[PDB]
């Protein structure tokens, strides 16, 4: 609504406006300050009374002159949704930053949208196999699920997601949303190029993927509502189109982090580690706007930049709570050179059950877990005294486990450049078989190096021959 | 049965938008004047009963 | 149709308000409104903001009374009038809550129509006094043999399930609920525990899976599910355990026995933290406000075995606290540990080791002890504690791998078999009448001989064998609940007979 | 707003009433508020730093904080004895103990 | 003791002024004279607006005060002592704030009830009169305090009326009724 | 005087600020009563903030309070009732019998706050209490009129240990006792009520040689704080006015520390180290200093302490650790060893343990025990890796004695004729010195280790050996 105001304060990117008329926009309304930098979009976040709101600014605030005229756009920012989104990279505002000009708008929807109700929930049970051995063996995914990754971001974390895109999303087909909060601009450009190359984006034709990209150069405040914008695009697919989607979020640490930055400026008493007090609510709301309703099933992949790789940090901790499966990837396992670097004793899925994937799968997994846990248990003893000073029975276990550890590496085709090894995807049925044999020590008689950086059991057998020469 | 229940909800939200249309009709009319008089005199009766 | 009747009801709400207290919103933001006015205002009162948002009031200041919204502030706006409900927060309490999922304000969120409520109650209700309490004497069997044996559950007891994040954390509790099917299905009202599962801070999908699991085991026909999903307001989350407690009290008051699982209180603390820090209350220790102990304690002390003059009522509680990184010295875990009467420490390493359910028996205590342990089960598991304790000591020495003497290896061999005996399949509790034999066998060392690998096979077979032959014996274990000389001899003979299979 | 003895309405009321400090708040002080064993006294403008000052509750104190418009005496005695507005004569001798 | 404390910050100043002028006995005189100097402060637009904002000295502030008491030689002496207080506290940004507050205390002392009948549009004079009658008839008027009826125009409050006075309101606006009707008819 | 009417201004938490009438001053540590639909809410005046606006701490729930509402002033500290009539009833913090044995027929009332006796008044004689519990008697004997301190974990039979002490020592003692429970569970409370009716130390129709002040954790943190002060004043009446000896017991005093920490935060004081109140030292000091053996009487306090996460380095136990005369540590490890008492033998120090005080023989015997056990612990690591075979012949005999001594400490408790169902034992002090002497001399090195487990005297060690031999 045309409500003039003046800019009382510009304390960071948290401008405060003072409306001069007694008509006052409500909280989560949006305002445009028009400048020679065009509109700057701000969003009301507090009412501080005396006709003075305090607004988060979703665009950079450098150059603002106090008292500058504001005009209130009214209500939450309305992005444009449709299938016309597919084949666009859109800014937080909704601007087509892939410069395919104005997006043909159908319905433009408010960024803030209440999460669907308890009644609307529909529980999954699907098996989604990625053909990644470690994923398949340890913690199978499911369609509609919330998948989770933890560790250093784009230190292999980004690559993991890229492998997932490469596998899952061609098979899945249909709508898919990639939303990248605070990602490295060059990496995003690579993704854009790659997507166009793999035709998922075909700009000449139609694209069955849409993209939202928020660069890490984008101001902290902008980054906060990149996520909400992406979720709206997803909701249009989930609800209105009613076709199964995909969603990628990288990193949802950036969502939390962005909030913590603005929180201080906003005027909140800092909570532990310095995180915003509204950390629990904001994360909660976000993670319940990503869900599988009876209307539609949205498989989501969420990437958590764990700061200093401390899981005990409250922001990663509260993330762990809202995920349906996680596959924490550890720097230590990275040092061991195992790519994928998923920690095998720190993965879980509610889909790993002896009903869900059957007793035989579960039994296979049980033995892997036990073997590896023993190996972890004897790590102290191994270091202090030689392995020869361990019990003979234990030495068999240790040798088996060393083999299992090496076996778990699966070359990835997206990482084909980096590894220099052509990637291989191994069937879920094949994976269970391969591990079963190894657990029975069938192929335990050939070097650890044979198991190192190679795919399935058959490949190992062949690789023994290669080494033997 | 599932579509039947859905249809009842659909009927209710359809009829909801008709409430919005009716709201615009009431506030347009000099019912906008006449019911304000009704409210005014009702407040007279009520506050006098205090 | 249904619409015409609903519209008739809506037309049927009229009649002017006299709004004896008003106040104008001014500082509102962060979902925490502060209104100026409200000269009359009870503390903890529920105030209806004029926008259809209701918010309880937790800070009364000589300027601006701080009313914490139960809604989102995107429907609130500056300078609104607020009308005091004139009732401190209250919930419908009744029998109809059985088989219903309800949100904090008692709206069925499973939408199985309006709650059949026999009363309303208030969120804060003072705990049962010293005088109206009688000592616990009523077992509660969780159907997890390790739990029953090591840390027996009774009625009116508070025992804290503590351990690392969602290590089937919910599932450990869920098993208890599931085993209460055996008595619950039964018509013995003196063994009827109506079960209330409280879920705070969990996403709607998690809750939905749980209620589905409960429906799968058809246990929802005795369950009440109080939920406060993570979407729902931090004030509503804070209020959520206390309104669950009152719902429990209706059962307790009726004298009917019940059990309330408070999963997870750790998220209540986060909620209270948010609430307090945006009520601008001075930051407490570890940022959790310093009165969290009082908050948690008052909640926990309302489960008790009421006196026989109070009709032997008993709400039983099981709090559940997630330990972040297993930090047992953290302020919130420390506070809860003190309040409770037991610890049921779950250890991640032992989970990975494949001891599921995973219990670090040294960090698990039941300070309310075997006064609530089944008399038969006490006899059989008498030296089980000693054996396990010896096993722990022996295992430590064994790590060094020095050539162990035969006495140490008697323990070691016995201990290994015991550990395998404890293990049980998740989502499949076992009948106590048929857990007493298994412990007899183990304690009377028959299994010590039997090879570790085939212990699992033996267990299955032993039960089948007892079902085949000594089903007269099993009936007696259920019926007489104390192993007499005759039962001990019968059982001894049966086990001996089954040694070679 | 800013903590001043003009926040204190009684002090302020004398000022509006055109009554002056008059060496009873230059000498001699009168307690404004006592909490935490830390009486904050309006007056005592002649006080030397860390000087021993004696209340009319018989309590003795020293004055660790000298602040503009308030002198933060720390009580050597129990809080219970002290109460607001109390005359606080200025003993006028910085802490000294018999030596010999 | 004031006629009910209201306002903390700045209102301790107002309270003091009130009680001090109660001991002066003449509160009305004080208020009236304060009103007159406050009005000429507002009707002094150059530096009576542009030096209501501290940026200048204590001594310079004092000399502004000296100019103010040249502007009126009627200001009592208690409100001249109030000038001293404000100069000493070097807070001029709450002079009219204090004036307003003193007005509230003063007219509480005089005993005049305050009210407003916000509506969507300015009401009939017959309506005003009927409402004035009603409010006086109601027990809300103690016969000791005489309402102010201030119409406010608030189209945002779509139709109806809301009467306000004391901490007691009756809101029979159209907007609220529509809101409730809609809300329950979304149920 | 003329009841100072106050209007509440802010209901914050326990902190409730009142705006008493101008020109009529209330006073520090006064007691305000606010008539409420349920009883009188008691607010203790804890600061004056001026303009006759006090900031007071609640001692009862603050729910439903309406900002502004008449607050009468009853003045001075909360005044409990004291008397010999106070024996035989459970009395809550605000001094009202909560066991409903009708209103206590007060002789006198006294304030909760009172000044610690002066240096001149305090004169303390060294006398030796007898515990009967063998480990306690030998390795850290207790002293009459002492300030015994049960440092230990959380409810690790903490209640049980105290219960054994009450069972033995209290029943034996001619003095009165006061059982004061600060912030403890109502399950524990109900058990204590029932049990002390059972042990007859409370005879409801009969006489009661004990009084109870049950403060439970379901009370506001503020109320939790002043449970200690209340109990103490009853003891002062006994000590002074009744002139009898006493045997005070307080439980668990970490709850006293914790409670004070919470309302400190509410009082707005900048939190001190590990969030404890910055007034912790002086507050602890006021409690401990008040408890003393004057010329007037003698009070033998036994105060339970919960050591959070068994880290005695934590400031709250550490501050208490100095202030208590006769420390005893009950350790997780010893409990886990299956040794009940859980007393840590090499971590038990008592003021009276001096050679002259306990007699040279007692001292020498106990000195030998200490060295033997300490040796066993030092060698334990060596046994762990190297094995026992690489130790000296002398050392191997010492290890064998130490294992025997370790289980010779075990004694079954009288109050664990419920817990373990094994008959309790009270072993005479002299008899324990003698019996331990025999063991050390190795005049029972022909006895197996389990024949020392949960025995009593020398007679028992032999008897259980004969029994086991069969």
Swiss-Prot record, chain B:
Annotated coiled-coil segments of the chain: none
Superkingdom of the source species: Eukaryota
Subcellular location field: Mitochondrion; Mitochondrion inner membrane
Oligomeric form and interacting partners: F-type ATPases have 2 components, CF(1) - the catalytic core - and CF(0) - the membrane proton channel. In yeast, the dimeric form of ATP synthase consists of 17 polypeptides: alpha, beta, gamma, delta, epsilon, 4 (B), 5 (OSCP), 6 (A), 8, 9 (C), d, E (Tim11), f, g, h, i/j and k.
Family to which the UniProt record says this protein belongs: Belongs to the eukaryotic ATPase B chain family.
Primary role: Mitochondrial membrane ATP synthase (F(1)F(0) ATP synthase or Complex V) produces ATP from ADP in the presence of a proton gradient across the membrane which is generated by electron transport complexes of the respiratory chain. F-type ATPases consist of two structural domains, F(1) - containing the extramembraneous catalytic core, and F(0) - containing the membrane proton channel, linked together by a central stalk and a peripheral stalk. During catalysis, ATP synthesis in the catalytic domain of F(1) is coupled via a rotary mechanism of the central stalk subunits to proton translocation.
Additional detail: Present with 12900 molecules/cell in log phase SD medium.
Record-given protein name: ATP synthase subunit 4, mitochondrial
Organism: Saccharomyces cerevisiae (strain ATCC 204508 / S288c)
Gene that produces this protein: ATP4
Shown segment, full-protein numbering: 193 to 242 of 244
Swiss-Prot record, chain C:
Listed GO biological process terms: proton motive force-driven ATP synthesis
Binding locations of ATP: 163-170
Annotated Gene3D superfamilies: 2.40.30.20, ATP synthase alpha/beta chain, C-terminal domain, P-loop containing nucleotide triphosphate hydrolases
Annotated site (Required for activity): 364
Keyword Protein transport: no
GO cellular component, one term: mitochondrial inner membrane
Location in or out of the cell: Mitochondrion inner membrane
GO MF, any single term: proton-transporting ATP synthase activity, rotational mechanism
Alphabetical list of InterPro entries matching this protein: ATP_synth_asu-like_sf, ATP_synth_asu_C, ATP_synth_asu_C_sf, ATP_synth_F1_a_nt-bd_dom, ATP_synth_F1_asu, ATPase_a/bsu_AS, ATPase_F1/V1/A1_a/bsu_N, ATPase_F1/V1/A1_a/bsu_N_sf
Modification Phosphoserine, positions: 14, 135
A Pfam cross-reference name: ATP-synt_ab_N
Keywords: ATP synthesis, ATP-binding, CF(1), Hydrogen ion transport, Ion transport, Membrane, Mitochondrion, Mitochondrion inner membrane, Nucleotide-binding, Phosphoprotein, Transit peptide, Transport
PROSITE patterns for this protein: ATPASE_ALPHA_BETA (PS00152)
Disulphide connectivity of cysteines: none
Additional detail: Present with 41500 molecules/cell in log phase SD medium.
Subunit structure: F-type ATPases have 2 components, CF(1) - the catalytic core - and CF(0) - the membrane proton channel. CF(1) has five subunits: alpha(3), beta(3), gamma(1), delta(1), epsilon(1). CF(0) has three main subunits: a, b and c.
Protein family per UniProt: Belongs to the ATPase alpha/beta chains family.
Name of this chain's protein: ATP synthase subunit alpha, mitochondrial
Curated annotation (Swiss-Prot), chain E:
Any matching Pfam family: OSCP
Domain of life per record: Eukaryota
Keywords: ATP synthesis, Hydrogen ion transport, Ion transport, Membrane, Mitochondrion, Mitochondrion inner membrane, Transit peptide, Transport
GO biological process, one term: proton motive force-driven ATP synthesis
Subcellular location: Mitochondrion; Mitochondrion inner membrane
Cellular component, GO, one term: proton-transporting ATP synthase complex
Gene3D superfamilies, A to Z: N-terminal domain of the delta subunit of the F1F0-ATP synthase
Coiled coil: none
InterPro entries according to UniProt: ATP_synth_OSCP/delta_N_sf, ATPase_OSCP/d_CS, ATPase_OSCP/dsu
UniProt KW Transport keyword: yes
SUPFAM superfamilies tied to this protein: N-terminal domain of the delta subunit of the F1F0-ATP synthase
Nucleotidyltransferase among keywords: no
GO molecular-function term, one example from the UniProt record: proton-transporting ATP synthase activity, rotational mechanism
Role, per record: Mitochondrial membrane ATP synthase (F(1)F(0) ATP synthase or Complex V) produces ATP from ADP in the presence of a proton gradient across the membrane which is generated by electron transport complexes of the respiratory chain. F-type ATPases consist of two structural domains, F(1) - containing the extramembraneous catalytic core and F(0) - containing the membrane proton channel, linked together by a central stalk and a peripheral stalk. During catalysis, ATP synthesis in the catalytic domain of F(1) is coupled via a rotary mechanism of the central stalk subunits to proton translocation.
Note: Present with 32400 molecules/cell in log phase SD medium.
Similarity-based family: Belongs to the ATPase delta chain family.
UniProt xrefs under PANTHER family: ATP SYNTHASE DELTA CHAIN
UniProtKB/Swiss-Prot annotation, chain F:
InterPro entries membership: AAA+_ATPase, ATP-synt_VA_C, ATP_synth_F1_bsu, ATPase_a/bsu_AS, ATPase_alpha/beta_chains, ATPase_F1/V1/A1_a/bsu_N, ATPase_F1/V1/A1_a/bsu_N_sf, ATPase_F1/V1/A1_a/bsu_nucl-bd
Protein's UniProt keywords contain Transit peptide: yes
Modification Phosphothreonine occurs at: 74, 199
Localization in the cell: Mitochondrion; Mitochondrion inner membrane
SMART domains xrefs: AAA
Gene3D superfamilies cross-referenced by the UniProt entry: 2.40.10.170, Bovine Mitochondrial F1-atpase, Atp Synthase Beta Chain, Chain D, domain 3, P-loop containing nucleotide triphosphate hydrolases
Phosphoserine, modified sites: 335
Enzyme Commission number: 7.1.2.2
Pfam family, one: ATP-synt_ab
Function: Mitochondrial membrane ATP synthase (F(1)F(0) ATP synthase or Complex V) produces ATP from ADP in the presence of a proton gradient across the membrane which is generated by electron transport complexes of the respiratory chain. F-type ATPases consist of two structural domains, F(1) - containing the extramembraneous catalytic core, and F(0) - containing the membrane proton channel, linked together by a central stalk and a peripheral stalk. During catalysis, ATP synthesis in the catalytic domain of F(1) is coupled via a rotary mechanism of the central stalk subunits to proton translocation.
Family that this chain belongs to: Belongs to the ATPase alpha/beta chains family.
Other noteworthy facts: Present with 164000 molecules/cell in log phase SD medium.
The protein's name in its UniProt record: ATP synthase subunit beta, mitochondrial
Organism listed in the record: Saccharomyces cerevisiae (strain ATCC 204508 / S288c) (Baker's yeast)
